[PDB]
């Protein structure tokens, strides 16, 4: 019997896949998580005592994006190692792909948090090998269900290439990318090339954005903006077609925006 359902914070969340809790935590009905600490118990009574008890008010590590009530803290794998094997542990629990989660010393991973009077709420996450050899500047990355489709995943996307963007490289994200992941980085994707070319080479497109050309290309073609010349993809669109498909509907929602002056960061 595996978990299937967790109470964190004031969310109580079924399951979409096994996770690989302790044998002991998985046969319980419920699993208990400290919003903060991310230590997970068997009974609503170690959960409410520990409610009492618990003194962290937000993630671990530094913080190095805050706008408004929006906050990212910065953990690495080796300087937290308990809070990150907990973290891979929630997040497995949504992500059928991730075989990851004892192993964090490689990894460094950045909290998404929702401020309030009571503190800093976890929303999401997305982890970055620290030495990436397939330039990867995101291995897994998940949003919790109740924060899904509601513009936090999107802005991990961004937050992740911004980073990127200060490393002076570009990055792809790790595969296979999730449902939910794959319709999303599309989408992100299509948004931030169709607003560079109302606002350039494929390689321009790729350093302006740190979105690898594979990935580059791949949206363009499935927006039918890119002629094939003698084995080599043309960026082919005039600035009415960028117009239509920029104020379609789907790009109607406000983001959750990354701005730039808010981020607190240096690369290594
Ligand atoms: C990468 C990713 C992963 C997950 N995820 C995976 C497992 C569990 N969750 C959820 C989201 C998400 O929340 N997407 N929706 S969105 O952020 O609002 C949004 C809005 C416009 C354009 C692009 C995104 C996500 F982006
Ligand atoms: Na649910
Ligand atoms: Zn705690």
């Given at each position: 019997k595996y978990v299937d359902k967790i109470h964190i914070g004031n969310?109580?969340?079924?399951?979409?896949?096994?996770?690989?809790?302790?044998?002991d935590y998985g046969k319980q009905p419920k699993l208990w998580l400290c919003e903060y600490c991310l230590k997970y118990?068997?009974?609503?009574?170690?959960?409410?005592?520990?409610?009492?008890?618990?003194?962290?008010?937000?993630?671990?590590?530094?913080?190095?994006?805050?706008?408004?009530?929006?906050?990212?803290?910065?953990?690495?794998?080796?300087?937290?190692?308990?809070?990150?094997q907990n973290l891979c542990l929630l997040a497995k629990l949504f992500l059928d792909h991730k075989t990851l989660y004892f192993d964090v010393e490689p990894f460094?991973?950045?909290?998404?948090?929702?401020?309030?009077?009571?503190?800093?709420?976890?929303?999401?996450?997305?982890?970055?090998?620290?030495?990436?050899?397939?330039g990867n500047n995101v291995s897994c990355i998940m949003i919790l269900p109740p924060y899904q489709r509601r513009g936090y995943g999107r802005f991990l996307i961004a937050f992740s290439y911004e980073l990127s963007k200060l490393?002076?490289?570009?990055?792809?994200?790790?595969?296979?990318?999730?449902?939910?992941?794959?319709?999303?980085?599309?989408?992100?994707?299509?948004?931030?090339?169709?607003?560079?070319?109302?606002?350039?080479?494929?390689?321009?497109?790729?350093?302006?954005?740190?979105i690898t050309q594979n990935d580059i290309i791949s949206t363009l073609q499935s927006l039918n903006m890119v002629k094939y010349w003698?084995?080599?993809?043309?960026?082919?669109?005039t600035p009415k077609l960028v117009e239509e498909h920029?104020?379609?509907?789907?790009?109607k929602k406000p983001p959750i925006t990354v701005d730039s002056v808010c981020l607190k960061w240096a690369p290594p």
């Open positions: 969310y109580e969340i079924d399951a979409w896949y096994f996770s690989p809790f302790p044998e118990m068997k009974y609503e009574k170690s959960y409410r005592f520990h409610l009492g008890q618990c003194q962290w008010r937000q993630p671990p590590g530094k913080e190095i994006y805050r706008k408004s009530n929006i906050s990212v803290h910065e953990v690495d794998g080796k300087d937290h190692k308990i809070y990150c460094v991973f950045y909290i998404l948090t929702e401020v309030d009077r009571q503190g800093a709420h976890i929303v999401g996450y997305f982890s970055k090998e620290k030495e990436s050899p397939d490393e002076s490289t570009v990055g792809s994200p790790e595969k296979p990318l999730s449902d939910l992941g794959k319709l999303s980085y599309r989408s992100y994707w299509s948004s931030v090339l169709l607003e560079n070319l109302r606002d350039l080479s494929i390689k321009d497109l790729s350093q302006m954005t740190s003698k084995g080599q993809h043309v960026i082919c669109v920029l104020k379609s509907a789907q790009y």
